């Protein structure tokens, strides 16, 4: 939530076989928004988490509300 409000980056739990290229196209096709930077890590439980830094044109807070997890 802090990253969404301050850094304008959303956070997702993505498929473990999804790379930065597919994560970008998945977010674009699912939420009609433009990522500009993606950073992925693998949690200690062996599940991928990806930080999706959105553009300045769109804001994380409204997109999070549209998704419904805000």
């Amino acid at each position: 939530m802090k990253k969404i409000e301050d850094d304008n980056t959303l956070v997702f739990h993505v498929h473990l076989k999804a790379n930065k290229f597919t994560i970008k196209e998945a977010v674009r096709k699912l939420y009609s928004v433009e990522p500009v930077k993606i950073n992925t890590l693998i949690r200690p439980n062996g599940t991928k988490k990806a930080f999706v830094k959105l553009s300045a044109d769109a804001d994380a807070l409204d997109v999070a509300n549209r998704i419904g997890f805000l």
Binding site: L16, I42, R43, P44, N45, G46
Partner: peptide, 22 residues
């Protein structure tokens, strides 16, 4: 630590889990 050991450690830590109360 590969994906495999990360999943192995997670399942090892999932075995010693408190029983559900139902």
């Amino acid at each position: 630590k590969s994906f495999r050991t990360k999943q192995k450690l997670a399942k090892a830590a999932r075995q010693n889990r408190p029983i559900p109360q139902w």
